[PDB]
Amino acid sequence: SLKITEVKAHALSTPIPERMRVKLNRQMILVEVRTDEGVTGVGSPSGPYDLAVLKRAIEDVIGPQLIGEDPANINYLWHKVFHGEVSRSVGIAAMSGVDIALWDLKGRAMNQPIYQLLGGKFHTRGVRAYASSIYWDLTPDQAADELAGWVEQGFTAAKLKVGRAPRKDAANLRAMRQRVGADVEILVDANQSLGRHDALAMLRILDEAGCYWFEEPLSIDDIEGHRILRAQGTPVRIATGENLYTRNAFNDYIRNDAIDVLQADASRAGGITEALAISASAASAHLAWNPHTFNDIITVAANLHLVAASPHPAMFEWDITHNDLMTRLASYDLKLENGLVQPPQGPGLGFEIDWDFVAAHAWKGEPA
């Protein structure tokens, strides 16, 4: 029986090189939960959110509610904190990072990867990944080149940011499909930038180009607009969720027949604990859960252990942008085999932290 002695939040911030910027810094909080017997777990509450707000929430609001507690009771602790002080968002985010750390700690205590605790792999072969993402302000040829580039590197799917210039978005999509043919999935992300009627015009283009999904087509507040898009009955999936923070917001999408793909992120929506609940509610409704994963290798890994164990058709976000928090933080890297990735096979999240890298990038006050 362990006891928690420390809850630490390490603020990290690395500037993005000039020629890469589409974006000032890749930031994260590396949560570290320590115990009296020396078993340690780590986590990440995603981002970008203010690092000092997160650090303060984790060490000084959540932390004291955990000191002295048996880390094994993750279910109890999640509910202790939720009905502790945070309730009376960045708070759910803060909770998520701690929750992941607790799951990592649990896997490490048992010497098992997280996915083994969750019933083992569903996707034994691996998980279909997509390249995230091809960004704004490209010509048709550049968009198609970058896509062909990802395919050549082994991806069978990629995402395109759209919504700033819909006529150009359409030109891009047509060049892309033409370049790669029908066997590559092309995903689209509008980041809430469209109203209902522009989204409907866009959906007709997506349908013609055979797009896999239309992500955040509208403001997250407009559930009815999402219902309208879904109601058009195209084979293009309506997707949202990276900016939703509760089951009792995802349920409102479900109840209203408003969504095809839930994108709840374990590092944002209440941890592995709540992501398990959100994933199951999606399954119950015969809808997909394909999480947003974009921040660092910890948020990616946390989501990947759940994805690998879930029966959902996989469409797994893999950040391909220049990001030291993806490639340098830990011993686990991208490895594609026939378009598929496999979760780390070590204990807990399944890899080791490069603590030299950690200390080298402590936050000094940088924004993003």
Ligand X SMILES: O=C(O)CCC(=O)C(=O)O
Neighbours of 272 (CB within 10 A): 27
Binding mask 220-249 for ligand X (x = CB under 6 A): ----------------------x-------
**3-class SS letters over 174-202:** HHHHHHHCCCCEEEEECCCCCCHHHHHHH
End-to-end Cα, the chain, rounded Å: 41
Q: Which does 5 bind (CB under 5 to 8 A by kind): Mg ion, ligand X, its own copies, none?
A: none
The amino acid present at 252, given as its one-letter code, is D
| Nearer Cβ to its own copies (53/148) | 53
| Nearer Cβ to its own copies (172/303) | 303
Binding residue (CB under 5 A) for Mg ion from 169, 189, 296, 319? 189
Residues 31, 45: Cα–Cα separation, whole Å: 8
Residue with CB nearest ligand X?
Answer: 294
The token duo for 31 is: 């949560």
Binding mask 173-212 for its own copies (x = CB under 8 A): ----------------------------------------
Residues 238-257 that bind its own copies (CB under 8 A): 243, 246-248, 251-252
3-state secondary structure of 340: strand
89 binds its own copies (CB under 8 A): yes
Whose structure tokens read 């469209």? 194
For residue 14, report the phi and psi dihedrals to the nearest 5 degrees.
-125, 120
133 binds ligand X (CB under 6 A): yes
Binding mask 204-243 for Mg ion (x = CB under 5 A): -----------x--------------------------x-
The amino acid present at 312, given as its one-letter code, is H
191 binds ligand X (CB under 6 A): yes
Number of residues engaging ligand X in binding (CB under 6 A)? 7
296 binds ligand X (CB under 6 A): no
Residue 60: Cβ-neighbour burial (10 angstroms; 0-12, 13-18, 19+) = exposed
Q: Which of 148, 151, 177, 180 is nearest to 339 (CA)?
A: 151
Q: Where along the sequence are the contacts to ligand X (CB under 6 A)?
A: 132-133, 189, 191, 242, 292, 294
